[PDB]
Structures are given as C-alpha cells and as structure tokens.
Amino acid sequence: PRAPRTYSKTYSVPKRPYESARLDAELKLAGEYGLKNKREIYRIGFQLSKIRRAARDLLTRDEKDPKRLFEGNALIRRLVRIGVLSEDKMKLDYVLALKPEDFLERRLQTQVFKLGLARSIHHARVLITQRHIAVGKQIVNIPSFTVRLDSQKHIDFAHNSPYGGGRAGRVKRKNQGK
Amino acid sequence: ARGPKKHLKRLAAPSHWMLDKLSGTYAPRPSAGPHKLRESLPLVVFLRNRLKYALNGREVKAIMMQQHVQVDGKVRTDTTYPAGFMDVITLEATNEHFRLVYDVKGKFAVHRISAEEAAYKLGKVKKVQLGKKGVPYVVTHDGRTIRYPDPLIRANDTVKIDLATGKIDDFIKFDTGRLVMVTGGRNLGRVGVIVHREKHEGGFDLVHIKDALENTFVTRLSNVFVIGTEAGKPWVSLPKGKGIKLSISEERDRRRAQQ
Amino acid sequence: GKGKPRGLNSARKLRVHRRNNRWADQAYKARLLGTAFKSSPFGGSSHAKGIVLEKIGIESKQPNSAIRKCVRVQLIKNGKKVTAFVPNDGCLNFVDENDEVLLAGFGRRGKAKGDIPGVRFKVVKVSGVSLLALWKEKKEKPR
Amino acid sequence: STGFGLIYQSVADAKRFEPAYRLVRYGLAEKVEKASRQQRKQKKNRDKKIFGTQRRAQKRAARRNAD
Amino acid sequence: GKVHGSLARAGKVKSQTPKVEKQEKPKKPQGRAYMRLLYTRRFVNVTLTNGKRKMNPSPA
RNA sequence: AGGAUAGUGGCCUACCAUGGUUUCAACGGGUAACGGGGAAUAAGGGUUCGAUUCCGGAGAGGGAGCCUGAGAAACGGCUACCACAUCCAAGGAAGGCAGCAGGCGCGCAAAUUACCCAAUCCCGACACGGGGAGGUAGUGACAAUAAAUAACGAUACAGGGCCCUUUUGGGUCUUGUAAUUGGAAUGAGUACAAUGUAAAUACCUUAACGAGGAACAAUUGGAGGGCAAGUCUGGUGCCAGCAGCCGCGGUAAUUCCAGCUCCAAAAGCGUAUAUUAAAGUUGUUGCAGUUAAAAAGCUCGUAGUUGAACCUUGGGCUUGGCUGG
C-alpha cells in the first residue's frame, strides 16, 4: 500500500493527577494567558521538556565539538527568532533557564492583547478565532500562532474586517438596513 | 519466488531518485539495460521529476513516442530505460544535451554540456579477454562491447568512446595521480586524485583519494572511475561544485553569504 | 565477592542464573506458563459473553453483613461456569435467567475483591444493552 | 488563488497533447458515452464463454432449445 | 462458603428514595470561559477566613 | 566410481570404512513463534512487543504428483486421493474468497455486494486496450493535529486604588457583584456560484440566510484518606448498597440512594485485560541469605569461572600543529 504518514503527540500529562501546588500554578498561568484548558499548558511544558533534553546532550559534549556548535547555534537562533530568547542570552545555559511564560508571550493571543488591539486577553482569542486579525497579508485564526520577531510589527486588523476598513458585519447590516 | 519481479514499491526505490512518499504506492521499476537497477535513473524520473517538462507519467510517454529523446545518439522510447553514469541524453527539439554525472551530494546532477562534448563519452573498463576466433574485446560500465581495443588497455582503465561509431579514441591507464570520481559508497560524487592503491588478494582493493582541499577518504576499487589524466584535467565537464564535499557548517556559511 | 561471578568471561553463568531465578516471580511464571491461556475462565481475554443460569446472592464476609447480589453465568466460548457480581442498587432486576450478559473482571486481576468471596467478574451488559444505561434510564431492555 | 496553466502554439497542438477531461471542460470535445464498469466487465466475461463468432454461437445455442 | 439469600429486597433503597427534580439553573460557561471563571474565584477575589480557605464551605 | 541435476554436494546408487553432534547443553519437548527494519516504556543499564504500509520466507481447504514455459512443484493451471460441497432428466457434469466487496460461523473484538483508470505504477503485438494493483468516496471517537461552546461595553452597587483632604463628606480609577441593560463580532449549519474532481462529495473561498435562556443549553468521573473537592439537606438503617486498598452503612451516614454545592480532565472521560516505569520486588550497573524467605551435614572433585610478581625505563637533541597572552 501507500507509505505511512508520520504523526506524533504534542503534549504529556503530569504523573500525579492531584497536586495543589501544580494545579494552582496552572490555573494562575491559564488565567493570565486566557487559555481554554490545561492541555494548552501541558503542550508548552512538553515541548520545553524536550528542549531541555536536547540542550543537556550538547552540554555534555566538549566545547568546540562540531555537533554542539552546529545544532546548539541553530537551536539558539530559532529561539531568538521567535522572540523567546533574548539577544544577549545566546549561551545555551540561559536556554535551560527558559520558562513557559516566555513561550506564552509569543503567542498571537498574547501579542494582540499587548498591542492594544483588544481590551483583554479573552477578547484577543475571539478576535483571532473570528477572522479579524491578519499577520502580513494573511489572515491567521490560530491563537497559538507563534509570532516571529520580523512578523511582530505586521500584526493588525484584517483589511476586510469591520474593525480594519472592511464592510459592516452581519448584525449591523440587519439593524441599519431596516 | 516463481519468477522475476516486475513492480517497485515507492519505499523500496533507490533513495537518490528523491521520490516523495505519498504520491502513490509504486515507483518506476527500471528496465533491464546498460546500467544496474540500483545505479540507474529511469527517463520518467528525469523528464518529470528533474526537468519538470512533463507533469505526469502520461506526458513522458507522449514526449518519447514522438522520437524526441535520444540516449547515446539513438532514439529511445522506453519510459523506464535505465540511463546511468556518463550517458548522453539529447533533446534536439529543445536543443539540449545532458550528461549523467554524480554531484557531490550523491545524486545525479542536472549537468548541461555543450554539443561538442556531447559527441563522446567515457566508460570504465570492467574486463579484457578474448572472444571467439581469438578477438580481444573490452566491456565498459554501461555494457558496451568494443572489439579490437588498444592492447595496452586493461581493466579499471577508462576509454573514450566515439559514441557515434562506438570505437575507442584513446584511453587512460589506471595509476597513481589519475583524476577520479567515486561512483559508490558514502563518498559518492567526490572528485580527487589517486594517492595510494592498497591491494588485498582475495578481498577488496582499497583506493586512497585526496580531495582538492587535501581531504583524504578511502573507498572500494569498484567505486572508482578514472576521469582524467591528472589533477584539474577531467575528460568531461564536471557538474557545479567540482565534486568537493563541504561539511554542513561550511555549507551553512556558504549559504549565508550567498543569500 | 558478593557471591556471584564477576569474571569478564562468565556471561553464560550470569545469563542462566538470572533465567533460572525469574521463575521465582509469580508474575513472570504466569506470562510464560500461559496460565491465563490455560487456567483463566476468560482464557486471557478482558471480556467474555455468557448465559445467565440463576440469580442466587452471596453473603458478605465479616465484619460486613449484606447480600451481594450475583448471577451464575455459563461462558459461551468454553462452557465454564463462573459467578459474576451485579453492581449497583437493584440492577439484579435487569438480569433474568437465559439472558446474554457481557462480563469483565473485577479489576483485581484474578483475585476476589472486598468482602465478596470467590467472585472475580462483574456484569457489564445484558441482552446487548449496558447495565449502566438501564440503571440511569437512558435505555430500555429489549424484551 | 494559485493554479497551473498551459498555452499551446496552436489549437491543433492543444487537441493532441491534452487529457480528454480538460477538452470536455473547455467544450472542445464531447464526453464519450459508455456503459458502467460493471456492465463492461460482465459483458467481457460473458463473451469469454463463447469460442468463435457470436452469430455461430447464438445460432447453435438456439438449435439446442427446440422449444 | 455457604452462599444463598432472599432476592426480594433488590433495589430497596433506590426504589423508595423520594424523586426530586433538578431546578432549571443557569448553564455553566464552557471552554476558555470556565477557566476564566475559576482563575478569578481563586486569585482575584480571595474569600479566605484569615488563613482558612475553603472551596466548598458548607453553611455554618 | 557412477547416476541424476542447470550445476556443487550422500542429492541418489554400488562397493568400502566407523565415523558425526554433545554439560561451551547435543537430541527431544513447548511456543497463546514467520524472521528483520521496527513499536511501547524509558536517568543509565534494561523490560515487553513486532499477524499488520518496506525487505526476505511460506501457502492458496489438507497432502502428493505434474503440463506449458526462461522462470511454477503455480493452485483466479491441471491430475489423483481425503474432508466438505453444487446441478441432474439418475445416464453424468462441475468445485476452492489466507484477491475486492459481501454472507454464514466464530467470537470481547473489526466498514460498502459503491465510482474510476484522471493520479502511482504494471502488463500486452501497444502513443490507443486492460488492471477491485492502485486511486476516490461510504462506514469509521483505532490512534494523531489544531481548535468553538462566548466577547465587550453602559449603568446600578460594593470594596479596594488614588486624589480634594485630618478622618467626617466627597471627587475619582482598578477589580467583584448584577432576573439589569445594550449594541457590535463570528462560525457550526445552509446556500446560490466558483474552485475542487475522471465525475462527484467534502475541504478552501464567497453573495443572501444563519446567536440572548445566544434551548446553537459538555460531558465523564468523583467530593473520609491515598487524592483536589461537604461533617450541607432529605431518604434507608449491618438492609439496600458503596468500597482498586484502608474501610462506610445499627435514626444529624463527610463513603449508600438523591437534591444543592464543590473538585479533576474535557470533546473527551470512565471500566476490563495485557504490558512498561514506579521495581534496587530479578539487582551486570544494583537486592537478600544469624533471627523476616534463603549456606548443600561434612570433605574430595570434573567441566565452568578465576588465578602472585618480573623483560626499553630514563636521559638528551631537534621537531610541527595548536591553545594564555
């Protein structure tokens, strides 16, 4: 038959289901970033858990090792590219020091609220889901869309949105049309 | 298994074709021909996947049935014909001549050549022996049989085929200092000069090759193809890159500067 | 010297000794002896269907005092007879003689649970309808 | 939107090197009318039971049924 | 062990439990909104009794 | 030595020797055993699985024997036997779904008797025919990805936050309550249509329609401990039942049956079984053996395992490539 298509899981659940310290930390963290559920917190922790594993293997190698230099610089460059890692912390030791709030800062939902286009973080998600926000000339309706540094300046209302120069929406047309 | 296989699973095809996983269940099975199955390139892959002249397998058959495609100066209509190393592909409708030479990345490069260079080819001598009525002959890497060769020509040498009469113009003896491209193994596509030939009776002889950057690698004698009489003097035009293998860090640095 | 060989060429002794001593692990014995395949009423399966033979009721163990309401079921796959508990308040009234019931273990993996003596299975479905659906009046028994 | 396009040197060249379904899309050809695949396959297998011409086969089959 | 007993009392308590209908209460918010409701309830308007914090205080 | 084979060969025959394997486990038995690439879990070391997208092997109900052909001991080829089994005018004849779809049976356990060669490829005398190979759709909560179920105001009313200030009384800006009040936004759905396709469906775009209880109404398990969240109310009263384990139930039951409230995960959640970590409870890393389980009654002893030290060191001369600075 046809070749199999690869797929993989993008999250992992905690080993201890009930722990007040972790439950309170998650809810405090979900409330700050307007997340739908706990799985969106597990997803960040999962990809951060494997970022640490990759960094540990390179850190055990000698400095100036060809694999450590190539993949370490590439991983740092990618993290700098999405704005998670600062430009003055490209040392692979500050990579281990990264925290989940660094990743939630770079979500589309966080940037819409922090750019003043929305009153609150929960307004940001519905604006995104309702096809109002465009990055560049492309409409993006995924709240977890990770904003790159060069894409940061191009976040604004979609050109065909009621808030961004488009026509009036469904509700207004029904009222003003009577 | 009761007989020869006639299918080729997509996953079981040679990796240097660079076929995608999800385009179908099967891959083009190369026909029997001058080149081995694992070391060939079917014309359907070349005309559709490489040049992208044809959009699908129906179109490559339409191209070849109008007599456009010539391999080694003869019109070929077999869509799965196993073209291989040093073969010449002529498309006089587009006025293009190609030679199948490996690039340094291990794949068959899209190597355009002049019409003057497309008038001959090189073949590695596999064996020299006597035929019926005591007539010596040479077998090249593409299955060619040339009678009455120069009596100095021996195995592992390279001959220059007139490619229109099939005769030998001249040859290169296998010896230290000859220009070489590697045609097998993980050093496939690299170009260098012979430094030292290490003999092993009953086993596999090993050849030490020095890159233009004074990088040394070892490969089996069966993967050695003599292409020039000395360094910097190849008998055919080399593909872009001149067969010098760069490390990934060097490639990343070169790509950064180019862009 | 810790009572086991340490020489670099004593791998056979180490491999055979470990192989001999894993037989002391009862969990290991059941996997290789195939006891679930040979001895378990389900034959190693998670579930098994059967026919209800009779409603009887089992007295609980001390210090508890109650009537655990079970049924006698004959398994279709091998004809063996087992006792299966009928969970929840009043679900025995959903189970009649000569009904087809789907069984499952009690979750203790071959041992009896709690004060219920000698019962290792529970009723999951009757007449192809979930016992929980009948209990919560989500569905009605087809009869 | 993004797609793919072909421009031939002439309409005659286009009609030669084009799939049938695209010419039907453009009105340059008529959709060929054939029976379903089940009917074509069943007819092929029915004809497999006849050796020789159909005229001979049906006349001989007719002769057997004296009715 | 000895196993037997009268089957007449099956479902005794559940049968005689007085049926009480659920009051038609407002729907709770779903999805992201429910996480928003819980976050404020636990970190914005804290209802602690001077170090005594209860999620479900019974009326007392 | 011969015969046979495409060919080596006890492959077989004639004659002749008595050899061949084995405690470094032969031979035999079992396998809920096709092998591998690989899968699950994983600090390391490991444990468990691999019928199944690729490769190799084997088979076409069970055997056996063959024809054609380069290639088959082929089975959508034949011959014969065994077991099933079809039509019959009773003389005879015809079978092989572990191919696609489908049916019976089996079961805890698995979908349509659909469309097409347009793509991927294969076959043929071949640019043209054929292909249940293959592709498309149907069923599909096997698994996997992203991700709705509301957002924002305005007032009311409260508190904090500040400021006019001594407090007083206010102005006033951040939260919480509002059966207490609005206007905005959108896709689920549907739909002209275009795109998509061999033709369609669906997706993606997109006119018009499409949200206040926005009934376009989120569920599954729990609330004594483990383990997060009730000593609330009613019912029962060692009964019914719960309860993985410890335990709960004999009239205010924190555990049953319910209502309210609350907790956990959420388009998913629970249960059963297997397996992995936890398990340093299989221990090579890395267990224990006086008394918790465990030194053979004691010596000898073959295989196995393991076995004291010792043989060009030091010095000197030049010598390249790199790393402080």
Ligand SMILES: [Mg+2]
């Ligand atoms: Mg909590």
Ligand SMILES: [Mg+2]
């Ligand atoms: Mg050849």
Ligand SMILES: [Mg+2]
């Ligand atoms: Mg040739």
Ligand SMILES: [Mg+2]
């Ligand atoms: Mg085990």
Ligand SMILES: [Mg+2]
């Ligand atoms: Mg007890």
Ligand SMILES: [Mg+2]
């Ligand atoms: Mg049943």
Ligand SMILES: [Mg+2]
């Ligand atoms: Mg015919």
Ligand SMILES: [Mg+2]
């Ligand atoms: Mg015919």
Ligand SMILES: [Mg+2]
């Ligand atoms: Mg002989």
Ligand SMILES: [Mg+2]
């Ligand atoms: Mg022989």
Ligand SMILES: [Mg+2]
């Ligand atoms: Mg088997």
Ligand SMILES: [Mg+2]
């Ligand atoms: Mg196995």
Ligand SMILES: [Mg+2]
């Ligand atoms: Mg471990």
Ligand SMILES: [Mg+2]
């Ligand atoms: Mg496998």
Ligand SMILES: [Mg+2]
């Ligand atoms: Mg396998």
Ligand SMILES: [Mg+2]
């Ligand atoms: Mg099996």
